[PDB]
Every structure is written in structure tokens, then in C-alpha cells.
Design a protein around this ligand. Structure first.
Ligand code: DGT
Ligand code: MN
Ligand code: MN
Length: 174
DNA sequence: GTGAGTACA
DNA sequence: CGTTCTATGTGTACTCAC
DNA sequence: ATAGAACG
């Protein structure tokens, strides 16, 4: 375990140091395209792991953008990886800590953040509401009866509100 | 080289 | 009848027949 | 959020 002060330090260092190797020359992951989520974005006092959400700008880099990932100048061991979820352990200070990573394309941004900030209890509650209205909300979208439901939205609030729910900051999300 | 059961969110 | 407790979801990456 | 069930 590690604190929000530790986490904040760790996430800030990484945002200089991320990139993936796309067939030789490695293309630099721009930090305006990475977003701290889960506990750290809710600003909980104590952290179990740092969970991060990378936004890809074309679909056909998902084949590359997590299983060929590098963090400059620091050690790590991989336990799992895929196109959209990739879990890593880090060596920080003398510390070993765990780092989840997650991807969505820009079309998906707020829903990935809303899904990934948690908390777990909030996600469990919030969904039942719309299953009662026979809708489905996921990392990627909002859908009904097998067809996506498009909305005129850009940020997470406009999503939560377009869904018809109290918007609140991630500290006390429940 | 399609398809159920599990692990971990 | 009011207060309170409780239940509630679903995708990714993996494994292991076939 | 939301509704049903257990309890005064
Ligand atoms: N724990 C958990 N998280 C889930 C689940 N489903 C979706 N999530 C989302 C919400 C979480 O905020 C996000 C990552 O959660 P984590 O497992 O890393 O923990 P979280 O960030 O909530 O805080 P933590 O790492 O426990 O200190 O994934 C689930 O079933 N369990
Ligand atoms: Mn976390
Ligand atoms: Mn996590």
C-alpha cells in the first residue's frame, strides 16, 4: 500500500516517461492524453494501486499500445497485458507497487473515465438504475437492446447529467 | 481456432 | 404507516477442452 | 437511485 502523496509523486514522474515501441522507433505517449483514475482521481487518503487510462487516437494502434509499452528510466515487471488492460509492478524507491493501465479511444473518453474512477460500489449502484430502464453502460458506451445510444456530450459531467444523475466530484462519489 | 469456466476487477 | 436495512454489474485477459 | 421487505 502507498499514500495519495506517494501516488501523486509516482504518477507525475511517469508522465514524462511513457511511450510505446511501434515497430522500431518508439512513439512518445503525450501526457495531455493520459488521465489518473480510480482511487487517485477520487483523492482517497490511502492507495492500493495506481490505475491509469490512456487515450489512443486511432483504433489500429491498440494492437501495439499496451503490450509494447515502456516507462523510461525505471524498472518494472509485467504480470498481464492486452489491447485494453495491462497490469504492471514497479520498483519505486525501495518500493514495489502495482500499476494498472487501461485504454480507450477519444470517442470513449468520459465513459472510460466514469467507468474507471469507481468506486466499485458506485458502479454497482448506478448500473442497476438503467438496467431497470433497459439500457447498458460500459467502458465504451451507452446502449439499448443491442444498439448504441449516442449523446451530444464531451465531458464526464455532461454524461452523468445526460444520463440524468447527480454530478459530484470524485472525492465523495458513492 | 470456436467456446465454457475463472480471475480480477 | 415511517425508518431502516438490503440488493443491485459486466468486461478483459487468461485457461483448458475440442 | 430505487424499490421491496423487516421492524417499530
Ligand atoms: N475493485 C473493483 N473495481 C472495479 C470493478 N469494476 C469496475 N471497477 C473499476 C472501478 C475502480 O475504481 C477501477 C480500478 O479499481 P481498483 O481495483 O484499482 O481500486 P480503486 O481504484 O477503486 O482503489 P484501490 O486500488 O483499491 O485503492 O476499476 C470491480 O468489480 N471491483
Ligand atoms: Mn486503484
Ligand atoms: Mn486497479
Amino acid at each position: 500500500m502507498l499514500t495519495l502523496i506517494q501516488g501523486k509523486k509516482i504518477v507525475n514522474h511517469l508522465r514524462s516517461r511513457l511511450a510505446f515501441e511501434y515497430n522500431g522507433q518508439l512513439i512518445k505517449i503525450l501526457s495531455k492524453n493520459i488521465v489518473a483514475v480510480g482511487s487517485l482521481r477520487r483523492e482517497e487518503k490511502m492507495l492500493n494501486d495506481v490505475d491509469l487510462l490512456i487515450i489512443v487516437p486511432e483504433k489500429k494502434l491498440l494492437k501495439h499500445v499496451l503490450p509494447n509499452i515502456r516507462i523510461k528510466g525505471l524498472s518494472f515487471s509485467v504480470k498481464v497485458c492486452g489491447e485494453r488492460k495491462c497490469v504492471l509492478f514497479i520498483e519505486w524507491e525501495k518500493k514495489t507497487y502495482q500499476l494498472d493501465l487501461f485504454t480507450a479511444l477519444a470517442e470513449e473518453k468520459p465513459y472510460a473515465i466514469f467507468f474507471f474512477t469507481g468506486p466499485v460500489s458506485y458502479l454497482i449502484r448506478i448500473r442497476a438504475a438503467l438496467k431497470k430502464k433497459n439500457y447498458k453502460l460500459n467502458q465504451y458506451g451507452l446502449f439499448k437492446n443491442q444498439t448504441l445510444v449516442p449523446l451530444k456530450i464531451t465531458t464526464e459531467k455532461e454524461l452523468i447529467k445526460e444520463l440524468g444523475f447527480t454530478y459530484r466530484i470524485p472525492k465523495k462519489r458513492l
